[PDB]
Write the structure tokens for this entry.
Amino acid sequence: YRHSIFAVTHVLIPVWIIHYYLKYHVTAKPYTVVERKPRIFPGDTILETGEVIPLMKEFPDQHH
Amino acid sequence: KRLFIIKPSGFY
Amino acid sequence: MLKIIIPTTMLLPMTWMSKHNMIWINATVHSLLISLISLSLLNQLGENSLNFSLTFFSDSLSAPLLVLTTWLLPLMLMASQSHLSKETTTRKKLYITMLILLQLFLIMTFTATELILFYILFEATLVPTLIIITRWGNQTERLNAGLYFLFYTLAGSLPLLVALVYIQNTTGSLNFLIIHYWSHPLSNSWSNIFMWLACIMAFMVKMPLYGLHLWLPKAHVEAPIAGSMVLAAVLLKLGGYGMMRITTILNPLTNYMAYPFLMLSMWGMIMTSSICLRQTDLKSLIAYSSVSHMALVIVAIMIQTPWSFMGATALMIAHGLTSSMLFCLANTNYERVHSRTMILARGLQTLLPLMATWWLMASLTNLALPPSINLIGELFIITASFSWSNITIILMGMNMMITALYSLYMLITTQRGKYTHHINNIKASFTRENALMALHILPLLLLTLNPKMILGPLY
Amino acid sequence: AGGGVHIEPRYRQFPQLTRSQLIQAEFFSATMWFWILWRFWHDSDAVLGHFPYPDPSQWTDEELGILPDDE
Amino acid sequence: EPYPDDGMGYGDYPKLPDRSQQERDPWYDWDHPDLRLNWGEPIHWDLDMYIRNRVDTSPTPVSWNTMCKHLSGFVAFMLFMFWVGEIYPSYQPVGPKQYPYNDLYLERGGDPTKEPEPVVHYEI
Amino acid sequence: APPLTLEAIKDRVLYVLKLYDKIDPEKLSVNSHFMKDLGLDSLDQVEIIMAMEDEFGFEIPDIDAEKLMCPQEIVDYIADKKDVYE
Amino acid sequence: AYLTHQQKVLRLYKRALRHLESWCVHRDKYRYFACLMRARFDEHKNEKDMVKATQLLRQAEEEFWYGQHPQPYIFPESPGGTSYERYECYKVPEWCLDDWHPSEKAMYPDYFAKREQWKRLRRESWEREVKQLQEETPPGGPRTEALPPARKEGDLPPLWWHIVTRPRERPM
Amino acid sequence: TGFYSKDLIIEAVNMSYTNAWALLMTLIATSLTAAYSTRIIFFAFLGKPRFPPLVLINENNPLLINSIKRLLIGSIFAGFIISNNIPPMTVPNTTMPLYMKMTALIVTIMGFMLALELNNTTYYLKFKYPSQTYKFSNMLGYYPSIMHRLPTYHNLSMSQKSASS
Amino acid sequence: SFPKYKPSRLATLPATLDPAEYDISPETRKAQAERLAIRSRLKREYLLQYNDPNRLGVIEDPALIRWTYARSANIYPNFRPTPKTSLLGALFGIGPLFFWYYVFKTDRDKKEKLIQEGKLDQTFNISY
Amino acid sequence: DSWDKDVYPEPPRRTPAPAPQTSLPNPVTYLTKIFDLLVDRPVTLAREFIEQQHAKNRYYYYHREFRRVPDITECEEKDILCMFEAEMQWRRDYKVDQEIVNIIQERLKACQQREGESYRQNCAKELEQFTQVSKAFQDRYSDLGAHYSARKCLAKQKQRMLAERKAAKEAAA
Amino acid sequence: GAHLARRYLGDASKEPDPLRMPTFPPDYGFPERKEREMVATQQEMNDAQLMLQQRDYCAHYLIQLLKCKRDSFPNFLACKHEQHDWDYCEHLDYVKRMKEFERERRLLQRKKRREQREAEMA
């Protein structure tokens, strides 16, 4: 009971308020939350468009 | 054993 | 401005017609009500000023000062009613009348549209202030303090009167708006050099400029607590406000005429901060710290940048609140031990815990700890000075170091260590004293949420 | 004394010990030593290096582009 | 013994030994134990500078001049050796590190219109 | 931390003394004068004071230590300093 | 007023032994070198004239200053220790109990009854101890900071209040 | 935990175009950290009890044991977990001489052994007055003795005599 | 002997190293006794007021008032313009002012010369 | 959204689709499912309720339209009314210029964070635009002082134009 | 190392200058000198968001390692072949730099030799 009350009142309510604030007020203005774009590697398929990143050219084949 | 602790008035 | 001025005037008949024991209650209630009304002046415009009538106007520079004055009056009343409890009814009413007269004069001073009207209202503030200091001060030194304050101010002000009437005869107007819109460049000649000096020296001695400051320790120390409150909080700011108003007719003469004053204040902030490290009188230490912050304001006004003016405005507001708080905190200990010597009553945190907390807050604000508006003003002025010349960072950094040292030194010596053995009359803090500190400190911190309200018209 | 007298103080003598403290200290010292041994077994390269350091003096002037002194 | 009459405003105030409060006896029963002061006794002109929160004049194991010499010599020797190690730096027997695409001309912010002077590395 | 009683102080004070070779344990008493009864000198008394300081973990100032001529004065001093009343 | 020769020799003995202990650390080594130091002090134990005894003391003090430990061991609660004056922030004076609100005091009726008993004791005994101080202090005032015991039945030692009622070493 | 940063730091400083004196000083300080760890262990834990006879040693408290335990597990495994979970934010030093690869281990072992030799000497029945290097190290290079007395005295003395009077 | 300890202003001579502690004359003994008597008289005077049950307030200390008066109000009544005071006043009051004026004026003249020839870049200086 | 995409550009967002090369479950996906259950859905519901209240109490505010007035170049010397209106227009224009510079600096900061390690090359356009707009703003409003005005700004422009014309004439030779 | 002693307490004109080398043309005594090949394109390095100093001649192994690290989460133990491939490529690059340093030194010594022999006869 102590831990559930603490969890809701100290984690769930604050995260509710913060998520509401960011989702509907902060991000209602440009450039407020700007996220560094994910690294993209050869082979990768882009979710949005659906394109497949080409694979790198054949490695010059250094052998250990 | 408990002793009386002298402190200033905290009432005000 | 009449919806502010007339209620303040009505404080006098109400004070004189109220019962002997309703004096403080009535004055406090209705001065707080007037301060509530003065807040509506903070609704300012981006470009124009609030030009009510031909004789009064308000802009972002004078509105925070007006709010500070109207707020200071009730706090004055709470601070005074302790040491004036044994006084007669008529004499209490006279003290309240002096405070009301001072507030009314300050209110009209900060809104006067004409330079000569500003001069008369700014000179009128001398009379109730001098009366307070010399009649209700505690020591024989209050008389000499009154003479110093009076004659320093007047030796500054009379040449300003001559310069103002000369300007009116040559330009045709002393109206602030006309003066701004019809601004003429000031040529380089002995005539113009002395016109500049006449226009500047009164505000210089009022702030005060280092070297012209010897009246301030006397006056702020010898005065009763309400007198010290107003002298530190609003009366010093008359020099800065007037300097900001009148520098619009002094260009480009200010480019080189400010060098002696810039040097004086930049070094004298160091000098007076160092003096604080060795002051044995608590009230004198608090009085001496005002000189350094006002030296920063002097530099900011003399370099004439938007950032410097913003910083100077914010610093004036923050210093008013903080210096009045510090004077009240010293006065609470003075009313217990009947002495201003700082090492008399030591280790007070183990006797007055919440008062020690108030002391820590006041010291922190005097430290200019971020994000307080003290720090905002100081930092803006420091950045503008750095642009003016990079070498200014040496002196201003030294000053903030020394300021930290003496602020925390005062805190440590008064609050920390071991209590004095033979001082057995440190009664618990009254609700009135705690409320005084709270009403000093709470609006100071709330201003951090809306800093543009005290950043002046150049924001 | 008061409440909580699980370890009674001793005069001029070695203190009273509990099994839990000895067992935990032994277990965690053993854990640190096992971790060092296991990691050394699996990652000798982090201590000894992975690849041989070459010897510059053994490189032929033709593999290095140093022509004889008459070119 | 008063201070000398040299126009500095000391008056008749006694010139006491310039000894910090930290040098006072801590086992004595002072009226002010923290300040190590007794009621009614003459206060040194420099009391607020010689309090235990502040300048200490206490005798030291090593004499003052010897400490100054050792500290100053240490600092000067360190500074000189740092300058020497600057003019005699440590490094590895390697040629410069090589990057492609003209030492990353574009990636480093080079003007995409002006053609860089080719920087070519070779299979040694 | 355990408190300190008068009997504990007396016991430890006598304990330290009984481990001093210059004192006779069967002649040692809480009222035995270190100089007169036990025949010591004040250097032995200095050493006795340092032994007490090490035993109880605190310092006895030399102005006060030089007056503790008897074990009982030692326990009285420790009791006064440690605020033990028993 | 001053320290006698014996007193100074004893102070130096104690200080030198403590710094020797700070240097030696281990108990056997300290015991060995402490007996050697005591032999040094016993060498001139019976010296005829005090001029060369004082010269020996001067030489010993110069040697001590040269060879002292830069940081000797300090007992934690002794001056200069790590726990020195750590408990001053809790030592509230006993006069603060009078300024308590009547609702704070009512939680401690027995204690404040005992306190009233002590206060009545102090108020009653004060006059006959100022008297004793007058009757015992020779003309010209006191010459030593010593104070007398109570000499007759029923009286209390003069100026006893702040010694007897001083804050405890671990008050709060 | 300290091996996954500090060892790489020594490797990088040995391999860089650096001030030679700074390299030598950081290597010597790497010996001295082993030396002072040896001092702590040798005097606090090894040897014989030197504390007052009333033994109050009691480390059996769940709060103490558990907090120290959590940071102990951190001190054992945290380097390996964080090293392998962050991406490569640098280029590695894959090829260095063997005497340079073991430099940090060699200097810390040297510090350990020399401190152990010096600490064990304190058991000998010999007593010698301290050298001047010991005095410089123990009194912290006399930096607080000089710089907390000279500049503060001059500042405060000026602040009274010239600034105020 | 051993290497001498040299006293300084900030690291003074310890009492045990002071030769005067070892050559004590009978008049020195009488001086010490008189000092003890003065100290005991002051201590007795303080302790009488301190232990008084019917004293409330602060025991006023004449030494403290003398100290605070000498440091504030006695200075100008006893100041004289002498070569030392006048030289020191000129050096410490006027010296730093003209020193800093020279420094700042030189810096700002160099800056203005750079600005006039456009040799000072202010590419992103739009806040002043 | 309310802001216009052209004034506040952002490149087309390109995320790689998930490419698991392991069998161990991804803790992030489950910590996000729990987030969507305990966090996102309730606040999302609380927002539909609130925007449902705001939908049935709809009311408006408008952008304030200022027409243009003659500027300070058209004011006869000492014609106080025309100077007042021109000066108010100039101060409004100055505030709008400050906000233009603010928009461009916003773009620059956003690009620097967004491009990650490749910002030096990938944000050349925003650095160029900031350079241009900051140069123009500097020319308009720098060194005027705390007591700036349209008159001082115009005098600075005339000084700049006299210098420019003289430089052009001497370069022509 | 021994190169530091050879340069400082010896003849530094016989030892390479780490700031200025190579000072001999790369085709001197190196016929059919082959330019190093890049695998990873500039765009691939850009969208992999490689740190600029990481964008060296072995950066394709770095990109492979980064991709596999992302695709092995939370198995931070897997993707260990990729790290070794990148490390070995970096090691080969470092041997190339050592080779360049040694070629610089053996050409500087030979320069001194050639000028010295020429000055021997006249």
Remarks:
- Chains E and A do not touch (no CB pair under 8 Å).
- The longest helix of chain E spans residues 64-87.
- The two ends of chain E are 88 Å apart (CA to CA).
